Design a protein around this motif. Sequence first.
Motif, short mmCIF file in Angstrom:
data_model
loop_
_atom_site.label_atom_id
_atom_site.label_comp_id
_atom_site.label_asym_id
_atom_site.label_seq_id
_atom_site.Cartn_x
_atom_site.Cartn_y
_atom_site.Cartn_z
N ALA B 102 0.86 -1.19 0.00
CA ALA B 102 0.00 0.00 0.00
C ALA B 102 0.89 1.22 0.00
CB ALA B 102 -0.90 0.00 1.23
N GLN B 103 0.61 2.15 -0.93
CA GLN B 103 1.26 3.46 -0.95
C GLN B 103 0.89 4.23 0.30
OE1 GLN B 103 -0.17 6.87 -1.51
NE2 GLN B 103 1.92 7.73 -1.65
N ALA B 104 -0.37 4.06 0.74
CA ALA B 104 -0.96 4.81 1.84
C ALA B 104 -2.22 4.07 2.24
CB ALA B 104 -1.36 6.28 1.38
N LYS B 134 4.71 -3.03 3.02
CA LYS B 134 5.63 -2.52 1.97
C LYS B 134 4.91 -1.40 1.18
CE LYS B 134 9.05 -3.73 0.48
NZ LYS B 134 10.44 -3.32 0.82
N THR B 135 5.65 -0.40 0.70
CA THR B 135 5.15 0.46 -0.36
C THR B 135 5.56 -0.28 -1.63
OG1 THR B 135 7.16 1.77 -0.76
CG2 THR B 135 5.71 2.50 1.04
N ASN B 136 5.09 0.18 -2.79
CA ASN B 136 5.56 -0.31 -4.08
C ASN B 136 6.54 0.63 -4.75
OD1 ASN B 136 5.02 -2.83 -5.34
ND2 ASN B 136 4.36 -1.72 -7.16
N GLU B 137 7.26 1.39 -3.93
CA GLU B 137 8.23 2.38 -4.39
C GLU B 137 7.76 3.23 -5.56
OE1 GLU B 137 11.26 3.42 -3.30
OE2 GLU B 137 11.07 2.23 -1.47
N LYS B 138 6.50 3.64 -5.46
CA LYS B 138 5.87 4.54 -6.40
C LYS B 138 5.63 3.91 -7.78
CE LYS B 138 8.15 8.56 -4.10
NZ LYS B 138 9.28 7.93 -3.37
N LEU B 139 5.79 2.59 -7.92
CA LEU B 139 5.63 1.93 -9.22
C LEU B 139 4.21 1.39 -9.42
CD1 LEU B 139 9.09 0.13 -9.23
CD2 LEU B 139 8.36 1.85 -10.93
N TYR B 141 0.10 0.66 -10.57
CA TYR B 141 -1.21 1.02 -9.99
C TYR B 141 -1.15 1.05 -8.47
CZ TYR B 141 -1.77 -4.10 -9.77
OH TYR B 141 -1.54 -5.43 -9.55
N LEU B 142 -0.31 0.20 -7.86
CA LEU B 142 -0.11 0.23 -6.43
C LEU B 142 0.58 1.52 -6.01
CD1 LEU B 142 1.04 -3.43 -5.71
CD2 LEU B 142 -1.25 -2.32 -5.18
N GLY B 143 1.56 1.95 -6.79
CA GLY B 143 2.30 3.20 -6.48
C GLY B 143 1.44 4.43 -6.67
N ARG B 144 0.48 4.30 -7.56
CA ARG B 144 -0.51 5.34 -7.78
C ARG B 144 -1.67 5.31 -6.80
NH1 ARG B 144 0.97 3.97 -12.84
NH2 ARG B 144 -0.85 2.60 -13.26
#
Lengths: 153, 158, 151
Positions: B102-104, B134-139, B141-144
């Motif tokens: 999750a980005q957030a 984990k984040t997806n390091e901004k990559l 659809y997850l990063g979005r």
Amino acid sequence: MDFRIGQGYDVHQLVPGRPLIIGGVTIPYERGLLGHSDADVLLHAITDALFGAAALGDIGRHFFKGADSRALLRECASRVAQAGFAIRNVDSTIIAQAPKLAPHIDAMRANIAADLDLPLDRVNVKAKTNEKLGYLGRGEGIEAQAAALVVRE
Amino acid sequence: MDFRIGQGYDVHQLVPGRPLIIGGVTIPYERGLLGHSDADVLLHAITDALFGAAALGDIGRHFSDTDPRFKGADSRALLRECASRVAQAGFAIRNVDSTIIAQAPKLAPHIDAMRANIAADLDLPLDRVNVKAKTNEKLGYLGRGEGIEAQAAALVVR
Amino acid sequence: MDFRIGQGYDVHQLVPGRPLIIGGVTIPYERGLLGHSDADVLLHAITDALFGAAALGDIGRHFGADSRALLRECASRVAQAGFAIRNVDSTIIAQAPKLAPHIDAMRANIAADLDLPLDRVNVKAKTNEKLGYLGRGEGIEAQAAALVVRE
Ligand SMILES: Nc1ccn([C@@H]2O[C@H](CO)[C@@H](O)[C@H]2O)c(=O)n1
Ligand SMILES: Nc1ccn([C@@H]2O[C@H](CO)[C@@H](O)[C@H]2O)c(=O)n1
Ligand SMILES: Nc1ccn([C@@H]2O[C@H](CO)[C@@H](O)[C@H]2O)c(=O)n1
Ligand SMILES: Oc1ccc(-n2ccnc2)cc1
Ligand SMILES: [Cl-]
Ligand SMILES: [K+]
Ligand SMILES: [Zn+2]
Ligand SMILES: [Zn+2]
Ligand SMILES: [Zn+2]
């Protein structure tokens, strides 16, 4: 006896003017991985898999300022042992459209095995492209997946 | 002894006007996960991993969305029924590990409560349940921030 | 005793002009998986999990053959390294077509090829909730986990 499994995931962006370091191996390439550390996606995934198997949380719960990912993997191994577990095996997959990882894989295994104090035959590393699909397929980042088995001795 | 492993995967879209429920924890947030149940992505992944370890198929085989009771279904109740079926098949659960991507929002302050919920539903001690974020390091659809993904692994013994 | 885990991943693009073969099953569909051989994304992922559990590298380092023959040769190599397969679990992520009706067929093919009882092989299916290249039907992914023991 008291076996446990863990799984790990990581991904980092590929950016210019950074070295590409995977499984502790520097691989010649026009881009490298972005992260606060040296951004070793493979070592991070394995680290997360080991903490997960020992039920110790995750890499961000534990972590060293400017420490490279091998030092962090070694400290992970220490904390796993501290919790009473022995590592039985690690398996993993790197997903990278490019560059070719083949001739670097055995070196990555040897690195991981030294760091975890495991014989070679208990450590494995695999590679895949993403068939040009998605951000991985466009070479915008590299992913790693890991699985670990541990036992409480 | 007759050990078996299972793995699970889930993703749901993140949309306005839904509660955010992950690992049974309601997290203050302006969006929530979209599905027919409460859309608890982490619990669904773990449920698939347990059914998988026991070779009982998957979550859609066991809990059909054609049933009205699936609408807004509590995913902890589903997880408990999954565990009951896994036990009925002759398996004891040894551990669960998982990852949320999750980005957030920030998941760290809710992780221990998610772990407690899973341990309760599986009748395990805390020390055999793990949840990682984990984040997806901004990559992608997850990063979005368009969805949230969960991965799970389970070890059981017959 | 001496258990080991392995994990596997594979993805192939989904396009018109090719048949859809997943877990050795041909599935009626307007499109199919692009790859060198049959593009069997599930068998490839499982083969990788098995080599991974045995620490034998990966499917590309070992290998007209179809993916079932490769799966059989994989099992033989795993056997020769001293390991017996205990179980396999897996997930196919495909927005379409509906895979549920073909699941027992896939399990039966996989079980046959690994010389396992049917109750040690599992296959699961998921959509991607319309997110990403999978959610748009541009590819199909598979994930696998395998447990072995050194006998
Ligand atoms: N959405 C997210 C993603 C990650 N995290 C926490 O940040 C650390 C780095 O991944 C990890 O320790 C992780 O638990 C978070 O709190 N919320
Ligand atoms: N390609 C797919 C994807 C999913 N499914 C079944 O539908 C349930 C919910 O997506 C899943 O849990 C699964 O049982 C399917 O049969 N084929
Ligand atoms: N970026 C990549 C991706 C994959 N590989 C190797 O290619 C073979 C087929 O995936 C596999 O044997 C795999 O190890 C590679 O060398 N570099
Ligand atoms: O019958 C169903 C349908 C969908 C399900 N699901 C989709 C994503 N997560 C759960 C589960 C069970
Ligand atoms: Cl992100
Ligand atoms: K993924
Ligand atoms: Zn990382
Ligand atoms: Zn779900
Ligand atoms: Zn393939």
